[PDB]
Design an enzyme around this catalytic site. Structure first.
Site, PDB file in Angstrom:
ATOM      1  N   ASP A 430      57.565   7.789 -15.518  1.00  0.00           N
ATOM      2  CA  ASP A 430      58.523   6.958 -16.238  1.00  0.00           C
ATOM      3  C   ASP A 430      59.494   6.365 -15.211  1.00  0.00           C
ATOM      4  O   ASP A 430      59.909   7.158 -14.207  1.00  0.00           O
ATOM      5  CB  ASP A 430      59.171   7.616 -17.218  1.00  0.00           C
ATOM      6  CG  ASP A 430      60.534   7.269 -17.899  1.00  0.00           C
ATOM      7  OD1 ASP A 430      60.485   6.285 -18.525  1.00  0.00           O
ATOM      8  OD2 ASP A 430      61.185   7.857 -17.510  1.00  0.00           O
ATOM      9  N   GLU A 483      55.229   3.313 -14.819  1.00  0.00           N
ATOM     10  CA  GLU A 483      56.219   2.103 -15.242  1.00  0.00           C
ATOM     11  C   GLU A 483      57.208   1.840 -14.224  1.00  0.00           C
ATOM     12  O   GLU A 483      58.074   2.634 -14.092  1.00  0.00           O
ATOM     13  CB  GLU A 483      56.607   2.714 -16.543  1.00  0.00           C
ATOM     14  CG  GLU A 483      57.516   1.453 -17.370  1.00  0.00           C
ATOM     15  CD  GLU A 483      59.082   1.819 -16.815  1.00  0.00           C
ATOM     16  OE1 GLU A 483      59.454   3.079 -17.092  1.00  0.00           O
ATOM     17  OE2 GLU A 483      59.589   1.093 -16.240  1.00  0.00           O
TER      18      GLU A 483
END
Ligand SMILES: OC[C@H]1O[C@H](O[C@H]2[C@H](O)[C@@H](O)[C@@H](O[C@H]3[C@H](O)[C@@H](O)[C@@H](O[C@H]4[C@H](O)[C@@H](O)[C@@H](O[C@H]5[C@H](O)[C@@H](O)[C@@H](O[C@H]6[C@H](O)[C@@H](O)[C@@H](O[C@H]7[C@H](O)[C@@H](O)[C@@H](O)O[C@@H]7CO)O[C@@H]6CO)O[C@@H]5CO)O[C@@H]4CO)O[C@@H]3CO)O[C@@H]2CO)[C@H](O)[C@@H](O)[C@@H]1O
Ligand SMILES: OC[C@H]1O[C@H](O[C@H]2[C@H](O)[C@@H](O)[C@@H](O[C@H]3[C@H](O)[C@@H](O)[C@@H](O[C@H]4[C@H](O)[C@@H](O)[C@@H](O)O[C@@H]4CO)O[C@@H]3CO)O[C@@H]2CO)[C@H](O)[C@@H](O)[C@@H]1O
Ligand SMILES: OC[C@H]1O[C@H](O[C@H]2[C@H](O)[C@@H](O)[C@@H](O[C@H]3[C@H](O)[C@@H](O)[C@@H](O[C@H]4[C@H](O)[C@@H](O)[C@@H](O)O[C@@H]4CO)O[C@@H]3CO)O[C@@H]2CO)[C@H](O)[C@@H](O)[C@@H]1O
Ligand SMILES: OC[C@H]1O[C@H](O[C@H]2[C@H](O)[C@@H](O)[C@@H](O[C@H]3[C@H](O)[C@@H](O)[C@@H](O[C@H]4[C@H](O)[C@@H](O)[C@@H](O)O[C@@H]4CO)O[C@@H]3CO)O[C@@H]2CO)[C@H](O)[C@@H](O)[C@@H]1O
Ligand SMILES: OC[C@H]1O[C@H](O[C@H]2[C@H](O)[C@@H](O)[C@@H](O[C@H]3[C@H](O)[C@@H](O)[C@@H](O)O[C@@H]3CO)O[C@@H]2CO)[C@H](O)[C@@H](O)[C@@H]1O
Ligand SMILES: OC[C@H]1O[C@H](O[C@H]2[C@H](O)[C@@H](O)[C@@H](O[C@H]3[C@H](O)[C@@H](O)[C@@H](O)O[C@@H]3CO)O[C@@H]2CO)[C@H](O)[C@@H](O)[C@@H]1O
Ligand SMILES: [Mg+2]
Length: 755
Positions: A430, A483
């Site tokens: 993330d 991401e």
């Protein structure tokens, strides 16, 4: 070696097999050394020594006995290897069971760690059951170079450390052997810093931890608690290219998928533990264990047809409300849901049911809690000392010093740890931008440039490259998903081509285009046709994962149905049209729990999902929809073989913005696997709507999202349609279709149908 020495191993007469098995130095040359690796592999016909970081492989030869193997290798250092073992038609790849003769740290261990290159440091740091001086006990070791003293406190000495003071080695690591205690021992490190202040720390390398909010570490005999059954799954993974497979991920937060009753114990794999109450505000509910989740989540997912489960972070974390993204126990699965062997069981059971496991992994920061890594030895040890690079002030967290060797090693070895001891199939990281940029969420004057005057966090980029290089070498065939939200290039390309080394990247632009598009009243979508098609312009610069994640159904964004305009029927229809389009658009797929049955409310991490909705038909129908779409996805090669090649996709037409219609082809290796996909993104049906197709024949309706069994109105082409020799959209043949309202059609030429 001699036949007599071999026979002593084979008949279990040898006094110490470590003398002969494993890796031993044969001689030193001028620039290199000569080593022998030996292994006794009963039932193996063949074996090889893999040096995955040098990209080499060497065969072993049988010597005096068909299952006793030897391999001679010349190399300056033989620190990083694996054994590949062939038994009949099966291969496995393992670490050498005779790699480490002692439980204690050797000079070699310390040297490699000091350089940041000890890929297996967690075999020696932390707490391990072993034997020293002929007595069984636990060896403890901890990196804390500026501490003035360290002692082990725990249940066994009533939390008084005065007779368990540790011995410092090479100015860097503290160790102690404690006889006659074993697994289950509860402990912390008591550290005195340079000032004389005393603190208590959880073990950074601990393998198990008390249930939050308590934080003492617990000793685990991690190689002797569980027996795996997934050799065949692992072999198949190692030998396949996951980019060319179907990948449909069900993203799950373990703590909030389903709860149980706190009026009973939590069942574990052959045992039980006290219930862990989900919160003080909801005291009648408890978390499910990894064991219960293996029994209920896994068959639920298998029956939905997803290929993978992606878990929000399961590393040990003190605060439920971080969702897992603020980790303080990096080497342990969270005790919220039971013990390490229960999570091993969970993984083993996924693999038995043909499901992979992706872990959200959080190397980007850690919170300040004083049990944890912060200011560990009375200095800025794990975190960089300068808050301009060492804190994420907006988040209230600390940022690892990626340039410091032992810190990098903590994290590099940590990622390998989860693939090694827990057999997972991928990771997702993330907020990669938060690591890559020296000016991340920092205003002018409050950050400094790198040594060349840029914003690139050089040490982070280098760390990330190393993680992905080593992960793929040691465990080929895994998923490493990023991401990254700022246009950094080559996120999902090889490190050797200048990339960061991931093999998939979330397509955040696509997610925003789609959710903004479907949120717009259907009449107005004609002004926003570009949302539908824009992402195909940059699509081939990365390998994209199309993810509709947890982050998109919280904080007032609504769950999926609630994002959609119109009455109830149209809200469902929009959800089916969006997801049929997502599943036919190029890229891999990720969606989050609750999306598959039309939960109305936002995801709330303090309760569980609104399962009672599945009593009602509309929710049942949407779930059947996803069940059938997942089956279609696994069944149609053109939906997955060529996601990342031009061949795999082509627009037929997208100029009809006025009716919000687009159409395209998907292709695979075989031309008879080609698909035609047609999307109608308004509730206006169309009756004799022509779409060009490249060939004559009968185009079978494989899928129609308006079918009544999905909740739709049941308009459609009655199962298929004959193409006309009627040029259209620059194609020689064409289909004269009915386009159902707010719906997507998937069609396939059956060239064996008779006119
Ligand atoms: O993924 C889920 C699911 O999707 C598919 O299955 C869907 C279909 O897509 C959907 O349309 C529907 O089809 C069922 C249908 O409900 C059943 O009734 C039956 O259909 C019969 C039909 O009743 C028979 O009459 C016969 O059809 C003749 C037809 O009578 C004849 O007139 C001619 O039709 C042409 C017609 O004259 C043209 O006007 C035009 O018709 C259009 C209109 O223009 C338009 O305005 C609108 O109202 O719809 C009309 C339909 O397109 O074109 C016509 C040519 O198509 O020729 C036909 C040829 O038969 O035959 C069929 C028996 O086959 O069965 C169908 C098929 O199941 O519901 C299903 C399920 O919800 C996919 O097939 C399935 O695999 C998936 O699981
Ligand atoms: O006790 C005698 C000596 O003790 C003191 O030095 C300490 C430092 O205070 C410690 O923090 C530590 O320093 C290590 C460090 O832990 C380690 O990561 C590595 O540093 C590398 C770094 O990883 C790399 O990125 C790059 O920047 O280079 C750095 C320097 O090599 O090595 C450090 C130095 O050993 O350990 C020592 C010893 O405990 C005191 O300051 C000394 O002067 C004293 O002699
Ligand atoms: O002969 C039946 C009709 O076939 C076609 O009608 C279509 C509409 O064109 C489509 O948009 C869709 O209709 C949806 C509609 O969009 C939706 O809002 C909802 O409307 C319901 C509402 O739920 C209900 O409670 C009550 O108010 O009645 C409304 C019924 O209109 O659901 C509709 C579908 O159930 O699909 C229909 C049927 O395919 C054709 O265009 C019409 O001309 C034709 O009359
Ligand atoms: O309703 C009676 C009519 O219905 C049928 O027409 C349909 C077509 O079959 C559909 O394909 C679609 O037409 C689109 C077309 O697909 C799309 O490309 C775009 O056409 C532009 C074109 O791209 C551009 O190059 C330029 O030449 O202008 C074209 C016309 O603008 O938009 C078209 C729709 O506007 O929808 C129509 C119905 O609207 C049937 O074929 C007709 O003959 C019949 O009269
Ligand atoms: O039944 C005895 C007792 O058990 C549990 O408390 C244990 C803690 O959970 C465990 O953390 C540990 O506490 C130590 C701290 O970790 C340490 O930092 C320091 O402050 O000393 C503590 C020990 O005094 O051990 C306790 C005692 O076992 C349970 O949670 C207690 O409420 C219960 O009474
Ligand atoms: O061969 C070029 C290209 O063709 C296809 O791209 C189309 C897009 O998919 C579509 O969105 C549209 O692009 C325009 C944007 O939408 C707009 O926001 C702005 O930036 O202008 C764009 C310039 O065209 O049209 C393009 C061009 O046809 C296909 O999808 C690609 O993969 C392909 O490489
Ligand atoms: Mg509930």
């Amino acid at each position: 070696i001699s036949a007599d020495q071999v026979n002593q191993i084979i008949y279990n007469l040898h006094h110490d097999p470590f003398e002969i098995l494993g890796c031993h130095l044969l001689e030193e040359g001028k620039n290199t050394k000569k080593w022998v690796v030996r292994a006794y592999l009963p039932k193996a016909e063949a074996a090889w020594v893999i040096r995955p970081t040098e990209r080499k492989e060497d065969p072993m030869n049988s010597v005096h006995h068909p299952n006793f193997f030897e391999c001679i290798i010349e190399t300056p250092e033989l620190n990083h290897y694996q054994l590949k073992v062939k038994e009949g038609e099966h291969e496995k790849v393992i670490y050498d069971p005779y790699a480490f003769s002692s439980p204690y740290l050797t000079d070699e261990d310390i040297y490699l760690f000091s350089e940041g290159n000890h890929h297996r440091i967690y075999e020696k740091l932390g707490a391990h059951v072993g034997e020293i001086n002929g007595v069984k006990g636990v060896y403890f070791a901890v990196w804390a170079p500026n501490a003035r003293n360290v002692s082990v406190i725990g249940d066994f000495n009533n939390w008084d450390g005065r007779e368990h003071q540790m011995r410092k080695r090479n100015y860097t690591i503290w160790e102690l052997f404690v006889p006659e205690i074993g697994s289950g021992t509860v402990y912390k490190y008591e550290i005195k810093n340079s000032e004389g202040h005393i603190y208590e720390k959880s073990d950074p390398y601990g393998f198990y931890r008390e249930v939050r909010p308590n934080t003492a570490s617990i000793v685990v005999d991690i190689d002797n608690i569980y027996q795996w059954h997934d050799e065949e799954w692992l072999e198949k993974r190692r030998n396949s290219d996951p980019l060319k497979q179907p990948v449909s991920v069900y993203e799950v937060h373990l703590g909030s998928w389903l709860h149980g009753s706190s009026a009973e114990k939590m069942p574990l794999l052959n045992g039980e533990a006290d219930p862990v109450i989900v919160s003080e505000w909801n005291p009648g509910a408890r978390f499910l264990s990894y064991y219960e989740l293996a029994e209920k989540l896994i068959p639920y997912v298998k029956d939905m047809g997803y290929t993978h489960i992606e878990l929000l972070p399961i590393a040990e974390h003190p605060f439920d409300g971080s969702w897992g993204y603020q980790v303080t126990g990096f080497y342990s699965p969270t005790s919220r849901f039971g013990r390490p062997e229960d999570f091993m069981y969970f993984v083993d059971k996924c693999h038995e049911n043909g499901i992979g496991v992706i872990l959200d992994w959080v190397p980007g920061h850690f919170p300040k809690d004083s049990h944890g890594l912060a200011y560990f030895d009375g200095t800025h040890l794990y975190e960089h000392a300068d808050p301009r690079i060492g804190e994420h002030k907006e988040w209230g967290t600390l940022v690892f010093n990626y340039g410091r060797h032992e810190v990098r090693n903590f994290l590099v070895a940590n990622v390998l740890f989860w693939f090694d001891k827990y057999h997972v199939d991928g990771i997702r990281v993330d907020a990669v931008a938060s690591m890559l940029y020296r000016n991340y969420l920092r205003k002018e004057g409050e950050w400094i440039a790198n040594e060349y005057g840029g914003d690139e966090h050089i040490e982070a980029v280098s760390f990330i490259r190393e993680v992905n290089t080593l992960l793929f070498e040691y465990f080929p065939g895994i998923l490493s998903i990023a991401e990254e939200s700022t246009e950094w290039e080559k996120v999902s390309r090889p490190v050797y081509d200048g990339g960061l080394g991931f093999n998939l990247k979330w397509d955040m632009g696509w997610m925003h285009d789609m959710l903004d598009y479907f949120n717009i009243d259907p009449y107005f979508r004609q002004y926003h046709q570009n949302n539908v098609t824009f992402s195909m312009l940059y699509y081939y610069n990365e390998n994209f994962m199309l993810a509709l994640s947890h982050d998109e159904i919280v904080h007032g964004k609504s769950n999926m149905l609630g994002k959609m305009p119109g009455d109830e029927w149209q809200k469902y229809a929009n959800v089916r049209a969006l997801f049929t389009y997502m599943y036919t658009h190029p890229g891999k797929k990720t969606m989050f729990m609750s999306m598959e049955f039309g939960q109305w409310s936002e995801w709330n991490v303090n309760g569980d999902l609104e399962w009672h909705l599945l009593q009602y038909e509309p929710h049942q129908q949407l779930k059947q929809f996803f069940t059938d779409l997942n089956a279609l996805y696994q069944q149609e090669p053109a939906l997955y073989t060529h996601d990342f090649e031009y061949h795999g996709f082509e627009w037929i037409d997208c100029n009809d913005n006025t009716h919000s219609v687009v159409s395209f082809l998907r292709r695979s290796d075989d031309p008879n696997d080609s698909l035609v996909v047609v999307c109608n993104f308004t509730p206006q049906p169309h009756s004799h709507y022509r779409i060009g197709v490249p060939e004559a024949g009968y185009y079978v309706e494989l899928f129609n999202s308006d079918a009544k069994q999905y909740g739709g109105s049941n308009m459609g082409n009655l199962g298929g349609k004959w193409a006309d020799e009627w040029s259209f959209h620059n194609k020689p043949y064409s289909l004269d279709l009915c386009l159902p309202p707010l719906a997507v059609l998937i069609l396939k030429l059956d060239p064996t149908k008779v006119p």
